[PDB]
């Protein structure tokens, strides 16, 4: 009765269990039928268990057994291209026991090692997997395998004369993997999308919330980022799936390609599904399983992106578990415990100096789905308070066919200054000044449109008409990006600034021409404008040539007067 127990009663979704004297609070327990449950209530004469599935498969007298884990994950060769679920297992094992991997020794007998040290390399999937000494293990390498082929279970090394090490390791998804230190936001996560990279930057290891109503394009921002962002690995927690969003990804993504290599994107991805038939428990643990896998890859020295479809549904699954445990409901009936937990999750994001030096990072992009436009609790409210970045897909911007549909007035990044130096040193000296100038343009447009909504546009001076003209070019030629175009699907950093300078240079020239009594109507039909409009489709620098083409054309307008 220490390691196992027997069902006393079941109905109303809680299983009461006699025994399980050594079970931990929040441990997964296993019913004979094969269902799993979570130990929620420990009482003097029973354990109350939340069942992660249908309780009719549970009867009084049924045997229940401990698992000993809040949970764990396997971390070694065989993770890439793999499709798991909330608790890691083929969509059951986790890592192939038969698959052979080419292990390459990166340490000699006599070397002194510490947790995080790299002892070997495995080209499991290009990616090159980095075999590390499990956290909390140090000493002297007394034995190490030679360059050959081995299965996961095999021992490749021994430390301190007997701890045995393999190519994989296990880790509690609930416990954030150790690290020496977390570094300050310094390097931008080059998205390739002009509005993001320019106005609402995400830093490598930053937490930037994606929030807005259903069908605004939240997931799509995430998917484009994975197809084109500068992270080597992606950890997609395709939660809030329904109707067929499961099968929509089941046989679809296995075909999506890596724009960078022309190989399957899954070849550098880990999927974590959260379907409706799955217990609230699994979906709750899914972000923790993902973040742990994410932290694992950054430990190798990779920059990984963690995309969380979504936390609104995770908080609903958690509220279901809490209410079943009879915890006191608060606002919208959510338990009090949620805010600290959600924050703790986002805190595990960041670019670090991994164990044994080297730098890696986990950038988090979380989807926000309020109950319906209310944009309050759970999701939005608590999230927008943590995250440093928010890209507001705007349904009105979408209906107007302005893509990406990111509202340049309601979106924000707290990382703008954090990443500006990376852009200034590696891309362009005028990155920050350019995005500030474009944003002031968009800001001015917003104010002008509010007034025009009242007094009409007929009274507008030429100066104000010019600002709307250029503001419109920014929205159509820059903010809007075509995810479906083979070229504009990804916009390299170098291309983003060059397009910005074409627009900003057209602005200066526009304001300069007006100041010299050039009719705005003359500028509005300037031939270069149509080329500036198709610039996002050009894959060659022929784009910066537009600056000189713009200047001469204005001169031809200074000529005619």
């Amino acid at each position: 009765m220490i390691q196992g127990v027997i069902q006393k009663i079941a109905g109303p979704a809680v299983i009461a269990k006699g025994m399980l004297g050594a079970r931990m609070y929040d441990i997964c327990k296993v019913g004979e039928e094969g269902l799993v449950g979570e130990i929620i209530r420990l009482d003097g004469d029973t354990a109350f268990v939340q069942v992660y599935e249908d309780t009719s498969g549970l009867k009084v007298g049924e045997p229940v057994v401990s698992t000993g884990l809040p949970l764990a994950v396997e971390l070694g060769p065989g993770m890439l291209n793999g499709i798991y679920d909330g608790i890691q297992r083929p969509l059951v094992h986790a890592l192939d026991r038969e698959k052979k991997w080419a292990w390459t020794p990166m340490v000699k007998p006599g070397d002194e090692v510490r947790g995080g040290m790299v002892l070997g390399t495995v080209p499991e999937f290009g990616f090159t997997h980095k075999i590390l000494v499990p956290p909390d293990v140090r000493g002297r390498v007394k034995e190490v395998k030679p360059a050959g082929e081995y299965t996961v279970e095999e021992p490749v090394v021994v430390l301190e004369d007997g701890t045995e090490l393999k190519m994989y390791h296990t880790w509690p998804v609930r416990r954030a993997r150790p690290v020496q230190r977390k570094l300050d936001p310094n390097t931008p996560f080059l998205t390739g999308m002009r509005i993001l990279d320019v106005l609402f930057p995400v830093a490598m290891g930053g937490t930037a919330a994606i929030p807005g109503p259903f069908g605004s394009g939240k997931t799509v921002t995430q998917q484009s980022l994975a197809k084109w962002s500068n992270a080597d690995v992606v950890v997609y927690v395709g939660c809030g799936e329904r109707g067929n969003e499961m099968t929509d990804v089941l046989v679809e993504f296995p075909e999506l390609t890596d724009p960078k290599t022309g190989g399957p994107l899954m070849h550098r991805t880990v999927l974590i599904a959260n379907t409706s038939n799955m217990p609230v428990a699994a979906r709750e643990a899914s972000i923790y399983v993902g973040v742990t896998i994410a932290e694992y890859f950054r430990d190798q020295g990779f920059s990984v992106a963690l995309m969380a479809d979504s936390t609104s549904r995770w908080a609903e699954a958690l509220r279901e578990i809490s209410s079943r445990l009879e915890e006191m409901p608060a606002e919208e009936g959510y338990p009090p415990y949620l805010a600290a937990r959600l924050a703790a999750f986002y805190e595990r994001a960041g670019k670090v100096i991994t164990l044994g030096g080297e730098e890696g990072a986990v950038t988090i992009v979380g989807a926000v789905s309020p109950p319906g436009g209310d944009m309050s609790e759970p999701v939005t409210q608590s999230t927008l308070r943590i995250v440093g970045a928010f890209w507001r897909l705007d349904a009105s911007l979408a209906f107007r066919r302005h893509f990406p549909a990111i509202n340049w007035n309601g979106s924000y990044s707290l990382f703008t200054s954090a990443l500006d130096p990376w852009y200034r040193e590696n891309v362009a000296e005028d990155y920050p000044e350019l995005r500030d100038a474009i944003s002031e343009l968009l800001q001015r447009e917003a104010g002008l449109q509010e007034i025009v909504q009242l007094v009409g546009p007929d009274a507008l001076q030429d100066a104000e008409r010019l600002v709307i003209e250029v503001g419109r070019i920014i929205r159509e030629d820059f903010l809007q990006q075509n995810a479906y175009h083979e070229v504009d699907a990804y916009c390299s950093m170098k291309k983003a600034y060059g397009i910005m300078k074409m627009i900003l240079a057209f602005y200066k020239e526009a304001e300069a021409a007006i100041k010299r009594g050039v009719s705005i109507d003359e500028i509005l039909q300037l031939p270069v404008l149509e080329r500036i409009g198709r610039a996002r489709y050009v894959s060659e620098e022929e784009f910066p040539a537009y600056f000189e083409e713009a200047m001469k054309e204005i001169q031809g307008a200074f000529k005619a007067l």
């Binding site: 006191m328 409901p329 919208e332 009936g333 209310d374 009242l454």
Partner: protein
Amino acid sequence: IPGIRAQIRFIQQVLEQREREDTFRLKRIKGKIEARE
């Protein structure tokens, strides 16, 4: 000027929509806590 009162009128009713009905899912939730307890 009857433009003011016009579309801006749509204004007051999405505003008013928003909450004598929202303020009510609520007088009643809290009932509901120890209304249910």
